[PDB]
C-alpha cells in the first residue's frame, strides 16, 4: 500500500507518496526533499516530527517512550506510513 | 548539563542497580537504566531487525582478552556456549575479542558465569570503561613482542573495575581463582603521589562516574601495525636497544573513528605522538592519561566525549602539560620509529621456540557451520591455546611440526584455506556485523561485503588489473567506524538503506587517514565509481604504487574529475 504523506515543513507543504515498507525519511530524501537527521536508526531526536493526522508504524524506533508516542511524536527515519498522514517536521527543538 | 548515562552511572551503586532487579524480572528485556548498565558487564541487549512488527530480544556478550590471547579452556567453553545458548556462531572482532550473539535473558546468567568459571571475563568489554587492550597477536617468543603483550595485559589489569558488582551479579560474589597480578600493577594502581586516585572510593581510578565514554589502548613493537595503532586513544610502542632489550615506550594519544553523518563537528582522527617514557614509568603515564580524560572529557554531550576531542580542542602541547601534572614528571621527546607494516599473521609460521603457529583467515570473523566444528576439533584434539587478531582472524598457537599436515588437512576439508588460495582482497577486508542485530546499522556490512569483494575483483579483471593485486576494503553499516573504514584504501560507510559513503586515502600499512570522497553511492551503482578510479590507477600509478598512495598523491580534484567524466 502507498499512502499520501503531507509534510508540514518551515518552508512549505510537500506532499509525497510513500510505500508502507519505506521509512518516511528515506522516501522524502529520494525525491529531493531535505529533512533533518543524524543517526537514522531511531535512537535520537534529530528527525523528530509530529503526527497531526493519520497513523505510522514506528515500532522499529527506541528513543521515544510510550507516552511520547501516544502524544503523536514520530521519528521520521524509523516510521512507515500505515495511512494517509500529515506530519509537522523539524520538531526536534520542540521535544527537546 | 550531564547526559542521561552520567545520572544512570551515579545512581547505580557502582553498576549494580537497577540491573540487579531487572536481571530477575519475567520480562524478556530489561529497562533503560539496566540496558545502559549491562554494557559495563560486557553484554548488550539487542533485537533482531530481520523480524518486523515484533521485538525479539536477545543479548550479545563480548569477552575481554588482552592481546587477543585465549586459553584452550576458554575456547572450548565459548564454542559450546554458542551452540547451546546462542545462535551457533562465534564472532571474532576488530579488537581481538569474541562476541556471542543471540542469548535469551533467562540464560544470560548461566552463560556469563560459565565464561567466568572457564578462564574468561566479559567485564568492561562494553561501557564507559577501558576496552580490550590490543597487542601483537602472533605468539612470537621474541623479547620485545613478549614485552608488548605483557604490557598490554598489565594495562588491562590496571584499568579493570574494582567495585565487585561483576562477581556480585554473575557468580553471587564467589571468589574466582586467577593468576596474581604483577606487583608492578598493584603498585601503580595504588599510587596517589600525584592526586590521580579517589582513595576512599570503591573505584580508586574510575570513581563514581567512570570515564566519559569508552577508552581504547593498543600496544605494539616498532614497525608492527597489525593493531591499527593510530585509531586508538593511546598507542603504545615498545622501544628497544640494539641487542633487542626493551628500554621504554613511545606514546601516541587521541585517535578515534566515530563520526555522525552531516555533523561535521564529529570526525575521525589520528593519534598524535605525545612522547617517550622509560619502561618502568609506563603504567604511571597511562593512568596519568586516563585520569586527564576522566577529569576533563565532556560529560554533557556524548558525541564529543572521546579524548580525541579534548586533544583537538586543547592541542597536544597543552594536553601533554596537563598529563604531566598527573605523571609527576615530563615526557621525553618521542623517539624516531621505523615505517609501519601491516601484518596479517596468516599461514604457517615459526614461534621461535621450535613450535609453529598458523593464522586462520576468517571472512568477517564469523565462525560457524563446519568451519566452527572443525576449528573446535583441532583446538580440542591438540589442546591448543589460540589468539584473536585485530583483523578478525584466529591464530592456532603452539603447533608441533608433526601436526602441520594433519591440521592443514582438517582445515582444508572445512574450506578454511591458506592465504595463497584466498583472493587478496578478502585477506585484508573487514566488515562490522551491522544488520540484523546492531541497533545502529543503516545498511548491511558483514552480510553484503563478500558479493562486493567479488564485484571489485570483477572490475579489476575488466580493467586488466592482475589478480595478485589488491586494496584494503573496509565496510561499516553506519559511520561509527567499527571496522575502522576511515583507515581503508577503499572504505564503504553505510549512509542510507542501500547506499554507502566512499572514503579513499588510507594506505596498506594504515599510516594515513582516508577522506570522504562521495556520498550516497547506491549499492547498484558502485562500479560507476570504481571502474573509472581503478582504470586511472592502473593507467597512471607508479611501479608498484598502492591505490591508497596513488590516491593521496593524485588528490581528490583529479579523482572526481575522472569519475565525473566517465558518466
Ligand atoms: C564487534 C565490533 C565490530 C567488528 O566487526 O569486530 C563492534 C561492534 C559494535 N560496536 Fe564498535 N565494534 C567493534 C570495534 C569498534 C572500533 C574499532 C577499534 O576499536 O579499533 C571502533 C572505532 C574506534 C573508535 O571507537 O572510534 C568502534 C566504534 C563504535 C562506536 C562509535 C564510538 C564513538 O566514540 O563514536 C559505537 C557507538 C557508541 O559507542 O555510541 C560502537 C558500538 C558498537 C555496537 C556495540 C553497537 C551498539 O552500540 O549497540 C556493536 C554491535 C554490533 C553487533 O551486532 O554485534 N562502536 N567499534 C568490534 C568490537 C570490538 C571490541 O571487542 O571491543
Ligand atoms: S559501524 Fe555501525 S553498523 Fe557497524 S557494528 Fe558499528 S555501530 Fe553497528
Ligand atoms: S535520525 Fe536519529 S532518530 Fe531518526
Ligand atoms: Mg579476517
What CATH number does residue B222 fall under?
Answer: 3.30.413.10
Three-state SS at B350: strand
- My answer on whether omega of the bond before B413 falls inside 30° of 0, hence cis, is no
Phi, then psi, of B96 in degrees rounded to 5: 70, 35
User: Cell for B329?
Assistant: 614528571
Cβ atoms B136, B224 nearer than 8 A: yes
Greatest C-alpha distance within chain A: 33
* Among B430, B404, B408, CA closest to B417: B408
User: Cell for B190?
Assistant: 595504588
Asked if the C-beta of A96 comes within 8 angstroms of chain B's C-beta atoms, the answer is: no
Looking at the fold, whether B329 and B354 belong to one and the same domain comes out as no
Asked if the C-beta of B52 comes within 8 angstroms of chain A's C-beta atoms, the answer is: yes
CA–CA gap between residue B365 and residue B137 (Å, rounded): 15
Asked if the C-beta of B261 comes within 8 angstroms of chain A's C-beta atoms, the answer is: yes
Kind of pairing, strands B246-253 and B234-240? antiparallel
Burial B139-174 (b: 16+ CB within 10 A, else e): bbeebbbbbbbbbbbbbbbbbbbebebbbebbeeee
Looking at the fold, whether B167 and B231 belong to one and the same domain comes out as yes
Partner B, chain A 61-80, Cβ-Cβ below 8 Å: 62
Looking at the fold, whether B210 and B266 belong to one and the same domain comes out as yes
Give the Å distances, CA to CA, from B458 to B249, B526, B527, B531: 44, 12, 9, 10
Other Cβ atoms closer than 10 A to B115: 23
* Ligand whose nearest atom lies closest to the CA of B91: 1
Angle, CA B89 vertex, CA B258 and CA B140 arms, to 5°: 70
B29 CA to middle of ligand 3, Å? 22
Cβ atoms B92, B394 nearer than 8 A: yes
What is the radius of gyration, based on Cα positions, of chain A?
12
CB contact under 8 A, A59 and B261: no
CA–CA gap between residue B87 and residue B435 (Å, rounded): 15
Domain carrying residue B237: 126-337
* Beta-bridge mates of residue A85: A5
User: Cell for B24?
Assistant: 530477575
Other Cβ atoms closer than 10 A to B51: 10
Side-chain half-sphere CA neighbours of B39 within 13 A: 19
* Among B182, B174, B134, CA closest to B158: B182
* Among B192, B203, B131, CA closest to B164: B203
Looking at the fold, whether B204 and B245 belong to one and the same domain comes out as yes
CA–CA gap between residue B59 and residue B551 (Å, rounded): 41
CA–CA gap between residue B95 and residue A86 (Å, rounded): 46
Looking at the fold, whether B300 and B333 belong to one and the same domain comes out as yes
What is the radius of gyration, based on Cα positions, of chain B?
23
Three-state SS at B258: coil
CA–CA gap between residue B445 and residue B435 (Å, rounded): 7
Cβ atoms A74, A49 nearer than 8 A: yes
CA–CA gap between residue B153 and residue B185 (Å, rounded): 10
The stretches of A1-96 forming alpha helices (DSSP H) are 24-31, 66-70
CA–CA gap between residue B164 and residue B563 (Å, rounded): 57
Report DSSP state, residue B67.
G
DSSP per-residue letters across B124-149: TSSSSSB-PPB---S----HHHHHHH
Cβ atoms B49, B87 nearer than 8 A: no
CB contact under 8 A, B439 and A60: no
* Among B383, B464, B496, B495, CA closest to B75: B383
CA–CA gap between residue B163 and residue B181 (Å, rounded): 17
Report DSSP state, residue A85.
E
What is the number of structural domains in chain B?
3
CA–CA gap between residue B189 and residue B185 (Å, rounded): 6
Dihedral (Cα; B293, B296, B298, B299), 10-degree rounding: 90
Cβ atoms B212, B297 nearer than 8 A: yes
Q: Is A54 exposed, middle or buried (0-12, 13-18, 19+ CB in 10 A)?
A: middle
CB contact under 8 A, B260 and A38: yes
Kind of pairing, strands A2-8 and A85-88? parallel
Which of A43, A57, A59 minimises the CB distance to B440?
A: A43
User: Cell for B87?
Assistant: 545462535
CA–CA gap between residue B37 and residue B15 (Å, rounded): 6
CA–CA gap between residue B9 and residue A33 (Å, rounded): 40
Phi, then psi, of B414 in degrees rounded to 5: -90, 0
Phi, then psi, of B524 in degrees rounded to 5: -60, -30
User: Cell for B516?
Assistant: 570522504
CA–CA gap between residue B339 and residue B381 (Å, rounded): 40
CA–CA gap between residue B537 and residue B463 (Å, rounded): 10
Looking at the fold, whether B229 and B354 belong to one and the same domain comes out as no
Question: SS3 string of B273-301?
Answer: EEEEEEHHHHHHHHHHHHHHHHHHCCCCC
Cβ atoms B273, B261 nearer than 8 A: no
Looking at the fold, whether B418 and B428 belong to one and the same domain comes out as no
Q: Give the contacts of B454 (CB within 8 A, at least 6 positions apart).
A: none
Looking at the fold, whether B366 and B445 belong to one and the same domain comes out as no
Last residue of a domain, one of B355, B387, B422: B422
Residues with CB under 5 A from ligand 4 (ion): B 391-393
With a 6 Å cutoff on the Cβ, whether A44 touches ligand 3 is yes
What count of CB pairs under 8 Å joins A to B? 31
Ordered strands of the B473-476 beta sheet: B430-431, B473-476, B490-496, B499-504, B515-522
Cβ atoms B490, B564 nearer than 8 A: no
Last residue of a domain, one of B337, B359, B376: B337
Angle, CA B185 vertex, CA B183 and CA B186 arms, to 5°: 65
Place of cell 533482531: B48
- Tell me the Ramachandran region of residue B500: left when phi exceeds 0, alpha when psi lies from -120 to 50, beta otherwise: beta
* Beta-bridge mates of residue B357: B349
CA–CA gap between residue B462 and residue B531 (Å, rounded): 8
CA–CA gap between residue B11 and residue B5 (Å, rounded): 10
Domains of chain A (ranges, CATH numbers): 1-96 (3.10.20.30)
Looking at the fold, whether B405 and B456 belong to one and the same domain comes out as no
Looking at the fold, whether B43 and B118 belong to one and the same domain comes out as yes
Report DSSP state, residue B559.
H
Give the Å distances, CA to CA, from A44 to A12, B303, B367, B552: 24, 12, 33, 36
* Among B489, B521, B518, CA closest to B505: B489
Last residue of a domain, one of B396, B422, B448: B422
CA–CA gap between residue B256 and residue B356 (Å, rounded): 35
* Ligand whose nearest atom lies closest to the CA of B344: 4
Looking at the fold, whether B321 and B379 belong to one and the same domain comes out as no
Q: Which long-range contacts (CB under 8 A, 24 or more apart) does B480-485 make?
A: B480/B257, B480/B258, B480/B259, B480/B440, B481/B257, B481/B258, B481/B259, B481/B268, B482/B94, B482/B257, B482/B432, B483/B94, B483/B430, B483/B431, B483/B432, B483/B445, B484/B94, B484/B228, B484/B231, B484/B257, B484/B430, B484/B510, B485/B257, B485/B514
Place of cell 553471587: B172
Cβ atoms B437, B446 nearer than 8 A: no
The answer on whether A31 is annotated among ligand-binding residues is no
Tell me the nearest-neighbour CA distance from A61 into chain B, angstroms: 9
Looking at the fold, whether B548 and B453 belong to one and the same domain comes out as yes
Query: Which residue numbers of B are catalytic?
Result: 62, 131, 214, 216, 432, 438, 478, 482
User: Cell for A52?
Assistant: 497531526
Ordered strands of the B69-70 beta sheet: B69-70, B386-388, B394-399, B356-360, B347-350
Angle, CA B232 vertex, CA B231 and CA B237 arms, to 5°: 105
Report DSSP state, residue B335.
P
Which of A38, A41, A57 minimises the CB distance to B441?
A: A41
CB contact under 8 A, B49 and A41: no
Q: Which residue of A21, A30, A41, A56 is the best one to mutate when testing the B interface, meaning the one whose CB has the most B CBs within 10 A?
A: A41
Kind of pairing, strands B515-522 and B499-504? antiparallel
Amino acid at each position: 500500500a502507498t499512502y499520501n504523506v503531507k509534510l508540514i515543513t518551515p518552508e512549505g507543504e510537500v506532499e509525497l507518496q510513500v510505500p508502507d515498507d519505506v521509512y518516511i525519511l528515506d522516501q522524502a530524501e529520494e525525491d529531493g526533499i531535505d529533512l533533518p537527521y543524524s543517526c537514522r536508526a531511531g535512537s535520537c531526536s534529530s528527525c523528530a516530527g509530529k503526527v497531526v493526522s493519520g497513523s505510522v508504524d514506528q515500532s522499529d524506533q527506541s528513543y521515544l517512550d510510550d507516552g511520547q508516542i501516544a502524544d503523536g511524536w514520530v521519528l521520521t527515519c524509523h516510521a512507515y506510513p500505515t495511512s494517509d498522514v500529515v506530519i509537522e517536521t523539524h520538531k526536534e527543538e520542540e521535544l527537546t | 548539563k550531564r547526559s542521561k548515562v552520567e545520572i544512570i552511572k551515579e545512581k547505580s551503586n557502582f553498576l549494580r542497580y537497577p540491573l540487579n532487579e531487572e536481571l530477575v524480572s519475567e520480562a524478556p528485556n530489561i529497562n533503560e537504566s539496566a540496558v545502559q548498565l549491562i554494557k559495563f558487564h560486557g553484554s548488550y541487549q539487542q533485537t533482531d531487525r530481520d523480524v518486523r512488527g515484533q521485538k525479539n530480544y536477545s543479548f550479545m556478550l563480548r569477552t575481554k582478552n588482552p592481546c587477543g590471547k585465549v586459553p584452550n579452556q576458554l575456547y572450548l567453553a565459548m564454542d559450546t556456549l554458542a551452540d547451546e545458548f546462542g545462535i551457533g556462531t562465534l564472532r571474532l572482532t576488530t579488537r581481538q575479542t569474541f562476541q556471542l550473539h543471540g542469548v535469551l535473558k533467562k540464560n544470560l546468567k548461566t552463560v556469563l558465569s560459565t565464561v567466568i568459571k572457564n578462564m574468561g571475563s566479559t567485564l568492561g568489554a562494553c561501557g564507559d570503561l577501558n576496552r580490550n587492550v590490543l597487542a601483537p597477536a602472533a605468539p612470537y617468543v621474541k623479547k620485545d613482542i613478549l614485552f608488548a603483550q605483557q604490557t598490554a595485559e598489565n594495562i588491562a589489569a590496571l584499568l579493570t573495575p574494582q567495585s565487585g558488582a561483576y562477581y556480585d551479579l554473575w557468580v553471587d560474589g564467589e571468589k574466582i581463582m586467577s593468576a596474581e597480578e604483577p606487583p608492578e600493577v598493584t603498585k601503580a594502581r595504588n599510587d596517589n603521589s600525584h592526586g590521580t586516585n579517589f582513595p576512599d572510593s570503591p573505584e580508586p581510578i574510575y570513581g563514581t562516574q567512570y570515564l566519559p565514554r569508552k577508552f581504547k589502548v593498543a600496544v605494539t613493537a616498532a614497525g608492527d601495525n597489525s593493531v591499527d595503532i593510530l585509531t586508538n586513544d593511546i598507542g603504545v610502542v615498545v622501544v628497544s636497544d640494539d641487542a633487542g632489550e626493551p628500554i621504554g615506550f613511545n606514546i601516541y594519544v587521541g585517535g578515534g573513528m566515530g563520526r555522525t553523518h552531516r555533523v561535521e563537528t564529529t570526525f575521525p582522527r589520528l593519534a598524535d605522538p605525545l612522547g617517550y617514557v622509560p619502561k618502568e614509568d609506563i603504567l604511571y603515564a597511562i593512568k596519568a592519561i586516563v585520569v586527564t580524560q576522566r577529569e576533563n572529557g565532556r560529560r554533557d554531550d556524548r558525541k564529543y566525549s572521546r579524548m580525541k576531542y579534548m586533544i583537538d580542542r586543547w592541542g597536544i602541547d597543552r594536553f601533554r602539560a596537563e598529563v604531566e601534572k598527573y605523571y609527576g614528571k615530563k615526557f621525553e621527546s618521542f623517539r624516531p620509529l621505523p615505517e609501519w607494516q601491516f601484518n596479517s599473521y596468516l599461514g604457517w609460521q615459526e614461534q621461535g621456540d621450535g613450535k609453529l603457529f598458523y593464522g586462520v583467515h576468517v571472512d568477517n570473523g564469523r565462525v560457524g557451520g563446519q568451519a566452527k566444528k572443525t576449528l573446535r576439533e583441532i583446538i580440542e584434539k591438540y589442546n591448543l591455546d589460540v589468539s584473536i587478531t585485530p583483523n578478525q582472524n584466529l591464530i592456532l598457537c603452539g603447533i608441533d611440526q608433526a601436526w602441520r599436515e594433519p591440521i592443514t588437512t582438517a582445515l582444508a576439508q572445512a574450506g578454511l584455506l591458506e592465504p595463497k588460495d584466498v583472493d587478496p582482497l578478502n585477506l585484508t577486508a573487514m566488515a562490522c556485523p551491522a544488520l540484523p542485530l546492531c541497533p545502529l546499522a543503516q545498511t548491511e556490512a558483514e552480510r553484503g561485503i563478500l558479493p562486493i569483494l567479488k564485484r571489485i575483483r570483477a572490475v579489476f579483471n575488466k580493467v586488466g588489473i592482475k589478480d595478485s593485486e589488491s586494496v584494503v576494503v573496509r565496510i561499516t553499516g553506519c559511520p561509527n567506524g567499527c571496522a575502522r573504514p576511515y583507515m581503508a584504501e577503499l572504505g564503504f560507510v553505510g549512509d542510507g538503506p542501500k547506499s554507502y559513503q566512499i572514503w579513499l586515502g588510507g594506505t596498506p600499512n594504515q599510516s594515513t587517514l582516508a577522506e570522504s570522497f562521495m556520498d550516497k553511492v547506491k549499492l547498484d551503482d558502485i562500479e560507476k565509481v570504481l571502474e573509472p578510479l581503478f582504470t586511472y590507477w592502473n593507467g597512471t600509478r607508479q611501479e608498484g604504487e598502492s591505490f591508497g598512495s596513488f590516491t593521496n598523491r593524485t588528490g581528490f580534484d583529479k579523482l572526481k574529475e575522472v569519475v565525473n567524466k566517465w558518466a
